[PDB]
Chain A
């Protein structure tokens, strides 16, 4: 029955001075105790063929590592005590496989660390005792701070023994602050030989593609993910002359690409599903649209629209509604001005608690104008202009929490962010730059960035500081003549596309070095 190396009882057993766990236990034995055993390590997948255990304990042993799934084969296990040993590290999934565990004690073995979510998989837990360990409080203990507040199980208080700046401090008392475990970087991945004016992304049949407008070949370039090597490859082209903006619009699982050209341009294309080739559908009126500088896509109350900015005095900036078979003229705006950019944003306008669709378009040598959507007349009215800001090339918007901000691009002088107040934009941050043709906010994995491009100088990447409530200098990219910046998201992968007017286009990887 019981091996003579270890003391036993009818319903109980106590083992001491053994280098290996006995292979066989009598069927009625339940609880097992190992004291000062010569174990080098726990056996991988140990405690097989001993299902009856309701309790187990180890004391005063020497364990360098406790392997994953060491406790599998114990469906009836409830109390687990591992304490008063010397242990350096244990694996995360060691406790995995026991959902019946009730009480657990890691106390007083002088553990300096624990792997994240070691306690995942035990949903029956009530009491846990970590006391007595020397706990270095760092990124490795951040998950444990998250776990202390979210667990219903009672846990006696434990203290930080390190780093010495935090000493005898309760791990329970810590909060989301006082932790910086994450930094971010943009590293160059691919270099595209062609120069580009604009880059855009779209999702067709749950597949995220990229459209790049190359001005000097007139081509509208399409890039698709390739799993075998680097994902970006060129799958298709649309041919045009002097293509400026290429805007894909997917409507009810049907792809439309609006491409603006400077030579007899402004054509609307659709993707034919069977042939999987782009087919010219409509031609935008050449008298209304002449020198388009921009295209903005937006959807309001289950209706799709797009608007083209005309920088010619003769042409008019025009919004095009979708009747379901195609795009047709809806409203002309800002007659006899030179329109460089159009921007759509939904902002709360006091008194209204609801957000309302708005337009912001930038006229050359003029102040930016804001249009409020009127639901009753289905038109933009109440033209209002951003005060004390002139020669704005473009306006882009981002939101932090509930508030919304805008990045205004001024080619000369300061380009500055502004926050939407009740009736107005208040000045927030002022950064001067030379030759800035783009100021682009980007949000990647809840990280707000602002990239400020420059021709004569370096492109300056900024990060949003929640505590400072302003953008902070972050990184400096080198790109020849940035006209645009686009965030591309593959599955769990993220990229940054940087257009270059006078040079080759840049593709940057989004790299996160992170610990817990």
Chain B
């Protein structure tokens, strides 16, 4: 089970110049301070989310800031992710910024929701505070990255409530008394993100860490043949295999998912099953104690049958988008509703917005326009609703159909309530810029196949790495060799 498995977040911390000045321009004070913050946040995540926060690398700016810092944390987040895209070449699951400046905003930090392990969205921004306060701030920013949201709809309902009255939970407003515990609903949101195909990287276990290697920490490090962790953890698994981070001569497998009875699991054993249509089952290499890197189907595979297309291990459909924004009780509207409402180009439906003008949806591209959902509550699950919800009813073939939408804004630049890019408006057609476009237009890369008209010769599936994962009894580069 993905929930049962331990997840590891490789984190890189970037300290701006103001953070450096707060520590009196001392590299050791800044590094030790950040390490302390990440360690406390790791304690919270380890206790609650069964997730470990590992500091892989840290970059500190002794000179002035590379990019201009801003009072708005969202603006500073855009600039920071821009810089980290073009400049930072280090491998990490998430890149977070520690800013000595204090953001003027209700937020003490900003992080892209569900952005974990995105080069563009994988980062977060955190304002300066005390070590405990910074640990909570990092906890809620990384929470946004792993898909933990406020979920305002259930909060207003009261079904989701932090049961600690004195101190809140992490996602809530932080007073002088600091929260140590996540809500159960936050846990469910994190597990739903994992189950939808998010954060596949998190299942990779860190090979190298910034801190000097210590034996018994549970992570193998260069020069360490094996690590079984704490003596009690060792007794659970890997006690006989590994002692003092030295492999026993009999047994090169100590503790791992692909590790059993201190010997490598045979090749082809399945460590973790696929979590959805877009995921691909990982298998034991037989040459490693850890399970193979978590991979998923390449973009463009069909998910939920016809209704959707796989992107980043996650299935994109209008129904899942409706259920995401307006809650699980919602479903996507019938296609006639899109067809009649969107062509009108009024407030009720449109292909887009211009200043003082509304864009009539073109006849050809409809399902790529304004997002319509059958049953819509008053309060969105995430973001803030702009204006009031739009409701229009249309009847096809003697049965009335209610189709509604709303404008929901996570941030000012990006507006929800419009069909997300990549949704399959039509066969061999993906929604892009409120338009139905043939899949061929953007030319998705495919895996090698010997046979024509098939993927991976028809014996395999394309992966995130653009390599064929062959079916049983078939092997090869193109999966074209028969080897039962």
Contacts and interface: CB of A to CB of B under 8 A. Distances in A.
Interface string B15-30: 0000000000000000
A262 interface: yes
B166 A215 contact: yes
Contacts of B166: 215-216, 242, 262
Interface string B91-116: 00000000000111111100000000
Interface in A306-326: 310-315
A166 interface: no
A241 B104 contact: no
Nearest to B137: A313
B160 to A, nearest CB: 16
Interface stretch (B126-134, B191-199, B355-363, B408-416): B126-134
Nearest to A309: B176
Contacts of B102: 336-337
A340 interface: yes
A465 B177 CA distance: 37
A263 interface: yes
A391 B104 CA distance: 20
A263 B167 CA distance: 9
B103 A314 contact: no
Contacts of A340: 176
Interface of chain B, helix or strand or loop or mixed?
Answer: loop
- Max chain B Cβ within 10 angstroms of own Cβ: one of A215, A310, A311, A338: A338
Contacts of A314: 106, 173
A448 interface: no
Contact of A311 (B106, B128, B175): B175
B175 A262 contact: yes
Nearest to A338: B176
A12 B240 CA distance: 123
Interface residues of B, number: 19
B105 A293 contact: no
A365 B128 CA distance: 9
Contacts of B107: 313
- Max chain B Cβ within 10 angstroms of own Cβ: one of A215, A340, A365: A365
A314 B130 CA distance: 17
Given A312-B173, A314-B173, A365 B106 contact: no
A127 interface: no
A336 B176 contact: no
Interface in B226-269: none
A410 interface: no
Nearest to B176: A311
Nearest to A335: B104
B176 A364 contact: yes
Contacts of B165: 241-242, 262-263
Contact of A293 (B104, B174, B175): B175
Given A262-B166, A365-B129, A291 B105 contact: no
Interface string A400-413: 00000000000000
Contact of B106 (A216, A313, A338): A313
Nearest to B108: A313
Interface in A284-316: 290-291, 293, 310-315
A336 B175 contact: no
- Max chain B Cβ within 10 angstroms of own Cβ: one of A242, A312, A315, A335: A312
Contacts of B103: 336
Interface string A258-296: 000011000000000000000000000000001101000
B173 A315 contact: yes
- Max chain B Cβ within 10 angstroms of own Cβ: one of A215, A262, A290, A315: A262
Contact of A312 (B104, B105, B129, B174): B174
Contact of B174 (A263, A313, A365): A313
B130 to A, nearest CB: 5
Contact of B133 (A242, A293, A365): A365
A313 B173 contact: yes
A293 B176 contact: yes
A343 to B, nearest CB: 16
Interface string B127-156: 011100100000000000000000000000
Contacts of A241: 165
A313 B104 CA distance: 9
B76 to A, nearest CB: 14
Contacts of B173: 290-291, 312-315
B161 to A, nearest CB: 11
A391 B129 CA distance: 11
Contacts of A291: 173-177
Interface string B207-232: 00000000000000000000000000
A269 B104 CA distance: 34
Nearest to B107: A313
Contacts of B130: 364-365, 391
Contacts of B108: 313
Nearest to B166: A242
A293 to B, nearest CB: 5
B384 to A, nearest CB: 14
Interface in A230-247: 241-242
Nearest to A337: B102
Interface in B423-463: none
Given A242-B165, A314-B106, 19 more contacts: A241-B165, A262-B165, A262-B166, A263-B165, A291-B176, A311-B176, A312-B173, A312-B175, A313-B108, A314-B173, A315-B173, A336-B103, A336-B106, A338-B176, A364-B130, A364-B133, A364-B176, A365-B128, A365-B133
17 contacts: A215-B166, A216-B166, A242-B166, A262-B165, A262-B167, A262-B175, A291-B173, A310-B175, A312-B173, A313-B107, A313-B174, A314-B106, A315-B173, A336-B104, A336-B105, A340-B176, A364-B176
- For the complex of A and B, the 5 pairs showing the least CB-CB separation, nearest first, are A291-B175, A311-B176, A314-B106, A311-B175, A312-B173
